[PDB]
Swiss-Prot record, chain A:
Taxonomic source organism: Homo sapiens
Keyword Amino-acid biosynthesis applies: no
UniProt protein name: Immunoglobulin gamma-1 heavy chain
Quaternary structure note: Immunoglobulins are composed of two identical heavy chains and two identical light chains; disulfide-linked.
Positions of the Ig-like domain: 4-103, 112-208
General function of this protein: Immunoglobulins, also known as antibodies, are membrane-bound or secreted glycoproteins produced by B lymphocytes. In the recognition phase of humoral immunity, the membrane-bound immunoglobulins serve as receptors which, upon binding of a specific antigen, trigger the clonal expansion and differentiation of B lymphocytes into immunoglobulins-secreting plasma cells. Secreted immunoglobulins mediate the effector phase of humoral immunity, which results in the elimination of bound antigens.
Effect upon mutating residue 97 to A: Impaired ability to activate the classical complement pathway
Portion held of the full protein: 237 to 446 of 449
Region (Constant (C) domain): 1-210
From Swiss-Prot, chain B:
Subcellular location field: Secreted; Cell membrane
Disulfide bridge map: 25-85, 131-189
Boundaries of every Ig-like domain copy: 2-101, 110-206
Lineage: superkingdom: Eukaryota
Function: Immunoglobulins, also known as antibodies, are membrane-bound or secreted glycoproteins produced by B lymphocytes. In the recognition phase of humoral immunity, the membrane-bound immunoglobulins serve as receptors which, upon binding of a specific antigen, trigger the clonal expansion and differentiation of B lymphocytes into immunoglobulins-secreting plasma cells. Secreted immunoglobulins mediate the effector phase of humoral immunity, which results in the elimination of bound antigens.
Glycosylation sites: 61
Residues included from the entire protein: 239 to 446 of 449
Subunit: Immunoglobulins are composed of two identical heavy chains and two identical light chains; disulfide-linked.
Protein's name according to its UniProt entry: Immunoglobulin gamma-1 heavy chain
Region (Constant (C) domain) location: 1-208
Length: 210, 208
């Protein structure tokens, strides 16, 4: 016992922002029983049925239920224009098909402002210091943030989740931890942001000892 | 059917004697057919019965959200005692146990750093005052802002984030009219955490 359940996952924020990448919506059905293992997917874009999804064969799990995945490739401009993607899942153990819908959050997009903040005077008594990137005033909350210096990725960073601000836009901070020496030697560090409301879906802000 | 969820105290409440920390047992999706709920509470095994149940708010789906509330001792929670909630029903095949306690591990003191607005931002009507709090453990923490002894309220604080060393960090953003910052007012980020001496510290921020 335990009827099937459906989870619908959006594309990754970077994937809709760059045409070289492949944005996808993923419809996952879990807890499919052995007695009723047949699963049917119907896909709709703004209520209109589409037939180009790629559905995988069911995969039995170690708890003896089946998991079935259907992947719908989306056009970047369709996602950014706010189309609604509906996954309809039909199983003979279900009273009625299960429907899940996903889209970009509704609202007018807002351009992020990106500000770099150097380490506090207090922190420069430690061996590692904190380079901060503040990204505020953006909408919707889908965004990507990265760090680099001299063209190469800096991996020792963490980014807060987006946070709803009091004007209804979002903000976040990204913290990059570097060895104090590197900051003191005047290296330039770069915070880069990918968001739909930026020109070319991209901006960069630099930060160095001055 | 009914679902049962247990919630911990607010961090501020466990850190100040004058505040009242509580654990909270909430029950969703309870029907009129079967809307009668019971509660038992236990603390580190040793049962207690100084709890208190509340009014079963009916919700917009013919279900009755029910809630019990157990008051807890500050140092019991900070010493890691477990708090178990058992809700006996009759539409229940069996009773449902649910337990909660403070995150395990050596507490670590937050470092607090204030950062002033970026130069680029100073062309706006309002500016962002930043408070970085890092290196703390557990993630239970409270952050406030004030100026001239009075609370600043137009601020937002990120959730704690797991850092690479296993400690947590967060950021708090206070937004002020740029004129206030230009005048030279002093703004204060205050941080409450169990690993702080007297559970409290302040860092101040002014135009300099
Ligand atoms: C039997 O086993 C199965 C299988 O489990 C496996 O086998 C067993 C035996 C064990 O070994 C087990 O450890 C194994 O994992 C069990 O199946 C599980 O069933 C549960 C439900 O019971 C599912 O729980 C939901 O998980 C969601 C998150 O799933 C992702 O994250 C977890 C890790 O955190 C992964 O394990 C998952 O696979 C998912 O991973 C995501 O997968 C996507 C699809 O591939 C990825 O997206 C794609 O990725 C590519 C790559 O880049 C491209 O980018 C594509 O473009 C992109 O589409 C995605 O990146 C990937 N992420 C990660 C991190 O890996 C939760 O979302 C979900 O929560 C919702 O539902 C809850 C109610 O059930 C609710 O409480 C939650 O709040 C939430 O509700 C939603 O909330 C959000 C906001 O918070 C709202 O937006 C929604 O509206 C709201 N919906 C509501 C309210 O309805 C669940 O927690 C679990 O995922 C599933 N596992 C697997 C592997 O599928 C099964 O339970 C067992 N049965 C029994 C009886 O025991
Ligand atoms: C019928 O309606 C009801 C009511 O909803 C309302 O009515 C409908 C009609 C709509 O109008 C709707 O919009 C309305 O909201 C529906 O009710 C919901 O039912 C779901 C269950 O299906 C419940 O979802 C769980 O939520 C838990 C968190 O709840 C808090 O947060 C939400 C917001 O996110 C609030 O809505 C809640 O009220 C809770 O808010 C917290 O409340 C506490 C109690 O008061 C507060 O603490 C106290 O506060 C006081 C004063 O404020 C003192 O300070 C005390 O000191 C303090 O203790 C607290 O502050 C407050 N916080 C916030 C932020 O508001 C989730 O915990 C839970 O998730 C777990 O379980 C999931 C299973 O679904 C699982 O998927 C999750 O991943 C997660 O699993 C856990 O994971 C962690 C690790 O991450 C592990 O530790 C656990 O082991 C693991 N547990 C597992 C796996 O089991 C659920 O998501 C929801 O509570 C409830 N809504 C309400 C409002 O109560 C109902 O669904 C409808 N029915 C139908 C059939 O449609």
């Amino acid at each position: 016992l335990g009827g099937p359940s459906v989870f619908l996952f959006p594309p990754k924020p970077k994937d809709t922002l760059m045409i070289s990448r492949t944005p996808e919506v993923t419809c996952v059905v879990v807890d499919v029983s052995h007695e009723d293992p047949e699963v049917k997917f119907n896909w709709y874009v703004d209520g209109v049925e589409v037939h180009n999804a790629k559905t995988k064969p069911r995969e039995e799990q170690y708890n003896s239920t089946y998991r079935v995945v259907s992947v719908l490739t989306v056009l970047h401009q369709d996602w950014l224009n706010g189309k609604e993607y509906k996954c309809k899942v039909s199983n003979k153990a279900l009273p009625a098909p299960i429907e899940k819908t996903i889209s970009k959050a509704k609202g007018q997009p807002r351009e992020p402002q990106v500000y770099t903040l150097p380490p506090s005077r207090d922190e420069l008594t430690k061996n590692q210091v904190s380079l901060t990137c503040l990204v505020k005033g953006f909408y919707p909350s889908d965004i990507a943030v990265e760090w680099e210096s001299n063209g190469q990725p800096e991996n020792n960073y963490k980014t807060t989740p987006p946070v709803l601000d009091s004007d209804g836009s979002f903000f976040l901070y990204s913290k990059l931890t570097v060895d104090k020496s590197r900051w003191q030697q005047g290296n330039v560090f770069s915070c880069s942001v990918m968001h739909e409301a930026l020109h070319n879906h991209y901006t960069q802000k630099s930060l160095s000892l001055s």
